[PDB]
Amino acid sequence: ELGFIRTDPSTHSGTIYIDATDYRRWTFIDFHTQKVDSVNVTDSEQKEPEEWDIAVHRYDVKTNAGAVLETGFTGFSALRNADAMPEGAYVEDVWTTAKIAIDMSGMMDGNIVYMESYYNEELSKWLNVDKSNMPPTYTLSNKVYMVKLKDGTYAAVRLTNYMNASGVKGFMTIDYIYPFEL
Amino acid sequence: ELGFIRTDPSTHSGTIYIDATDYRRWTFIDFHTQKVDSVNVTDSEQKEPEEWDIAVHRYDVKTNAGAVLETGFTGFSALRNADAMPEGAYVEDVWTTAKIAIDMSGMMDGNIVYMESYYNEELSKWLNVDKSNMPPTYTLSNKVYMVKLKDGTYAAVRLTNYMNASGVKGFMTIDYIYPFEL
Amino acid sequence: ELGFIRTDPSTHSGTIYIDATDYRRWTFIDFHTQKVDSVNVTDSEQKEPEEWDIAVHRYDVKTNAGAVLETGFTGFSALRNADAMPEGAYVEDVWTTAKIAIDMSGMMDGNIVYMESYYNEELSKWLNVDKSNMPPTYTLSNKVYMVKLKDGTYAAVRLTNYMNASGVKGFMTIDYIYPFEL
Amino acid sequence: ELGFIRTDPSTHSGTIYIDATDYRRWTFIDFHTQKVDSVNVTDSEQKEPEEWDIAVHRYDVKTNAGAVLETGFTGFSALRNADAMPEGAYVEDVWTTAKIAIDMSGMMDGNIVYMESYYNEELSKWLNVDKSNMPPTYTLSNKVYMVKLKDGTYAAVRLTNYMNASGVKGFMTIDYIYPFEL
Ligand SMILES: [Cl-]
Ligand SMILES: [Cl-]
């Protein structure tokens, strides 16, 4: 009951459910093979897999030389009715040095430890965390993201939830269509 | 390609797509039998069907002696992970005399013709039309609505879109789970 | 129900009623054969017919290598009594790249999607949509347009309405005389 | 990895490390047998164990017909050298209806869902969560709590941490001496 938990071959779709709670973890997702792999960045014996499509760290996401465009669609049944692909320019990952927090334990003292990493600003819009509010607000975009993968095929992805059943944050429920074809 | 357009018996779910564009029309939906029927309110020869679960008029919706509660869920994969039903009190339909517009053609002269009808204020939250803005904003709630039907069973419903593929308003894409069971 | 719905052969006149609601559609009108054909511009298996006189997309109109004069007449009874053909310059279609909207949904791309197309500016005056007001105001010109066709014959056309009986916009009621002769 | 992870039999002491992150869970600790058991309160096939000494739900704690004294000691070395048992009133659990949160998601119901439960107010002082600040401040008391068990034996407990190594809250590190004897 973690990873590719539900899949429907006839509609090329399914649901991924992963424990992205730990700040030391990247969870790699491969839509081609339906595999999920975790890497603890503080363990040099653990390396990223040879093949992967997206990677999630807490609410942050990166692609594997991919590009992403946020659509206006809020569900797959609406997306399947579209007549044409987007004309817009997809967004590639950017290199970051103060974005991916690997240790949050000293945050009450203003000390967050970061790692350097690629990060996709477009796909990470799947959740807006506005810390300036008391209390901070966690807002799902509810949008379908079109992800152009390095092999030229596309995945349609949507973050449907960021909590487990009782409200613990960092459990990510990701619906997908792969390969997405009009 | 109108009515119950996609259904998956194994997950008790599917998608309804209906032309709710005309203001004279009520479209009746029966999740039990997967049937859709239209009634032109200006034609006395057309009567409502003997059995139905929800009815849609443009963006307005009513139940057949049912009750509705808006959940916080924005997708079915999130809803299926819940451990318990809501504790809250569901909302029953209210009688209205100036809500259901059957003729909008004189609206530029401030004349709208209404009919008297039941209306569910909770389920109709599926789309918020704020006419006070220039231009008016059409905002899908994206929420899953729990509908307790008169026979004691439940349907989970979500309005995923209010437009056809080119943007014509009043075509409603409704995803559902019936019977919904934890 | 749709097309050349009312015709009077003794006067070579009638009324055309078309569903021009969809932004992907061009509806081709052939006054010579009293036929109407639709083409969904997103489906490359649907082709423009071999013969046609005018084409309508929502409120937009183009001709088939024709030319149009907005006459001073606001009814057919006065036009039928004219002793000479109306004076003035007949205006040919112009090319446009941001006039014919084919996707207004804002879903695949946030912006309106336009197609490149010929467009008759004179005949398109049959309806003025003033967007500078909120709500925008829709004013029928009530003028009779003379359309000089490529074979040298003439059609007289007048848009009498742009909504169906309940106020759904995009249903076009067009009165015509073809072949127009003094 | 979890449970009684470090023990020193020569001093009857050790460290308990538990995943108390989930709001549906009660983790039962039995100092007599060095066993830990979890119960998901939403699953009626999971029952409380026959024997247990204290139980933890996130930062909340209750006893098994026990009683607790927050002593003045802030370390075990000084406690082990005490010449008499600490003075003060041992405090029994109190009944609560809006203290033990079992669903913090706001999904089925917008409000927090609480369960009715016993709760030890004295032992729950091991962590102070001051919600009147934004961000809320988490202060460990660092005190040694003496827990008088129903069999008349005593456990000394001290919460040394409430987060895992990356800052994920709800992982509880509890140092203990059982059976505590002077
Ligand atoms: Cl950065
Ligand atoms: Cl009313």
3-state SS, C70-118, equals ECCCCCHHHHHCCCCCCCCCCEECEEEEEEEEEECCCCCCCCCEEEEEE
Tokens of B31: 């999740």
- Are B86 and B146 a contacting pair, CB within 8 Å? yes
Rounded distance between C-alpha atoms, residue B38 and residue D102, angstroms: 45
Chain CA centroid to CA A84, Å:
24
CB pairs under 8 A between A and C: 27
How far is the alpha carbon of D42 from chain A, nearest alpha carbon, in Å? 10
Contacts of C170 (CB under 8 A, 6+ apart): B168, C19, C20, C21, C22, C58, C59, C162, C163
Rounded distance between C-alpha atoms, residue C46 and residue C40, angstroms: 7
Among residues A14, A15, A43, A18, the alpha carbon closest in space to that of A28 is found at A18
Chains with 3 or more CB pairs closer than 8 angstroms to B?
Answer: A, C, D
Q: Is A152 left (phi over 0), alpha (psi -120 to 50) or beta?
A: left
Interface contact flag, B74 A166, Cβ < 8 Å: no
Tokens of A24: 């030391």
Rounded distance between C-alpha atoms, residue B143 and residue C98, angstroms: 36
- Are D7 and A153 a contacting pair, CB within 8 Å? no
Rounded distance between C-alpha atoms, residue D5 and residue D176, angstroms: 12
Interface contact flag, B73 D107, Cβ < 8 Å: yes
How far is the alpha carbon of A105 from chain B, nearest alpha carbon, in Å? 29
User: Minimum-distance ligand to the CA of B96?
Assistant: 2
User: Minimum-distance ligand to the CA of A100?
Assistant: 1
Technique behind this structure?
X-ray
For the range D25-28, what are the long-range contacts, defined as Cβ-Cβ under 8 Å and sequence gap of 24 or more? D25/D57, D26/D55, D26/D56, D26/D57, D27/D55, D27/D56, D27/D57, D28/D52, D28/D54, D28/D55
- Are A163 and A84 a contacting pair, CB within 8 Å? no
Please state the domain extents for chain B.
1-182
| B71, B73, B81, B83, best to mutate vs chain D, most D CBs in 10 Å | B83
Interface contact flag, A168 D102, Cβ < 8 Å: no
Kindly tell me the burial class for residue D152, based on how many C-beta atoms sit within 10 Å of its own C-beta (0-12, 13-18, 19 or more).
Answer: exposed
User: Minimum-distance ligand to the CA of A96?
Assistant: 1
Cα D30 to Cα A90, B31, D14, D47, distances in angstroms: 56, 51, 13, 15
Q: Scanning every residue of chain B, which has its alpha carbon at the shortest distance from the alpha carbon of A173?
A: B78
Helix (H) or strand (E) holding A78: helix A76-79
Touching pair C, D by Cβ (3+ pairs < 8 Å): no
| Prior bond of C9 cis (ω within 30°) | no
Quote helix, strand, coil % in chain A, to nearest 5: 10, 50, 45
Chain B residues in contact with chain C using a Cβ-Cβ cutoff of 8 Å: 21-24, 102-108, 134-135, 163-168, 170
- Are A120 and A93 a contacting pair, CB within 8 Å? yes
Q: Scanning every residue of chain C, which has its alpha carbon at the shortest distance from the alpha carbon of B163?
A: C105
The residue type found at D52 is W
Distance A71 CA to ligand 1 centre (A): 25
Q: Scanning every residue of chain C, which has its alpha carbon at the shortest distance from the alpha carbon of A89?
A: C109
Distance A122 CA to ligand 2 centre (A): 44
- Order of strands, edge to edge, in the sheet holding B91-92? B3-8, B13-19, B169-177, B154-163, B145-148, B67-70, B91-92
Interface contact flag, A161 B75, Cβ < 8 Å: yes
Q: Scanning every residue of chain A, which has its alpha carbon at the shortest distance from the alpha carbon of D41?
A: A166
- Are A172 and A163 a contacting pair, CB within 8 Å? no
Q: Scanning every residue of chain B, which has its alpha carbon at the shortest distance from the alpha carbon of A72?
A: B161
Of D103, D134, D135, the CB nearest to A167: D103
Of B78, B83, B160, the CB nearest to A77: B160
Rounded distance between C-alpha atoms, residue D9 and residue B93, angstroms: 67
Interface contact flag, C23 B167, Cβ < 8 Å: yes
Rounded distance between C-alpha atoms, residue A176 and residue A14, angstroms: 6
Interface contact flag, C24 B165, Cβ < 8 Å: yes
Rounded distance between C-alpha atoms, residue C20 and residue C163, angstroms: 10
CB atoms within 10 A of CB C77: 7
Rounded distance between C-alpha atoms, residue A80 and residue A182, angstroms: 7
Rounded distance between C-alpha atoms, residue A127 and residue A4, angstroms: 21
Place of tokens 């917008």: D110
CB pairs under 8 A between B and C: 54
Rounded distance between C-alpha atoms, residue B180 and residue B31, angstroms: 11
The helix/strand count (H/E) of chain D reads as 1, 15
Rounded distance between C-alpha atoms, residue A120 and residue A91, angstroms: 7
Touching pair A, C by Cβ (3+ pairs < 8 Å): yes
Residues of B in contact with A158 (CB under 8 A): 75
Rounded to a whole number of angstroms, the distance between the first and last alpha carbons of chain B is 31
Q: Scanning every residue of chain B, which has its alpha carbon at the shortest distance from the alpha carbon of A161?
A: B78
Residues of B in contact with C23 (CB under 8 A): 166-168
Chain CA centroid to CA C67, Å:
13
Chains with 3 or more CB pairs closer than 8 angstroms to D?
Answer: A, B
Helix (H) or strand (E) holding C56: strand C54-57
Cα A24 to Cα A21, A40, A58, A101, D153, distances in angstroms: 9, 5, 9, 8, 41
Rounded distance between C-alpha atoms, residue C118 and residue C54, angstroms: 11
Distance D78 CA to ligand 1 centre (A): 48
